[PDB]
């Protein structure tokens, strides 16, 4: 899988 973060933030995948 490509990297993600389960933490919700104003913009994701930065």
């Amino acid at each position, epitope marked *: *899988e*490509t*990297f*993600t*973060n*389960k933490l*919700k933030e*104003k*913009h*994701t*995948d*930065l």
Partner: antibody
Amino acid sequence: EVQLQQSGPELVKPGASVKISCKTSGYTFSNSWMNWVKQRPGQGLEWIGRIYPGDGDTNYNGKFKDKATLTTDKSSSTAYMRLSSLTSVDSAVYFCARSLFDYWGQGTTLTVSS
Amino acid sequence: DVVMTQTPLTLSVTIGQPASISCKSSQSLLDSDGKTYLIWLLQRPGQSPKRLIYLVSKLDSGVPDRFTGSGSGTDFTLKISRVEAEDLGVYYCCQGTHFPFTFGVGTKLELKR
């Protein structure tokens, strides 16, 4: 790799509704915002709104709030956009786009016509 | 809403020459979290947009080094150090700081030969 795969083209009559899908693969779907964007000649690219699949939080452009409804099915890693009360000005190509517009679907062409 | 004003509207350029596009926003794109949510996208005809630059100056994976992004506040530039034939298309700036998120009108890049 991240893949966003949209549903096929649609021809719908004025006053009707349509639901377009964006099936995702290659990342954990619940962890990235999904946006929807309109592209029409002359109007350019317009952001419709977004949904966070992890909790169903949505943000809409006020221009589209009475027209668009965004949902997700986590079980199939798919995002959906319903557009209602359609008129000719809704004819356009619609895109799903992840996160800060980092990956885009191939587009779905909608034509509103009798 | 935040208006994104791009210039020029058309870029007519020869291979190897440098080129640039500027984007003005009607409100500062600096967010209270310290980030500036400004990106640049390229769309070729009949294709979807692809992101090239994000957070003003960061290059997306697989984007040639010939592309750089700079700026702050309300004023931003996309620079191409030497245009290649495959750079053709329509470039858009877009902002994700203020709701609703908005796009510039697009700059078409065409090649001379």
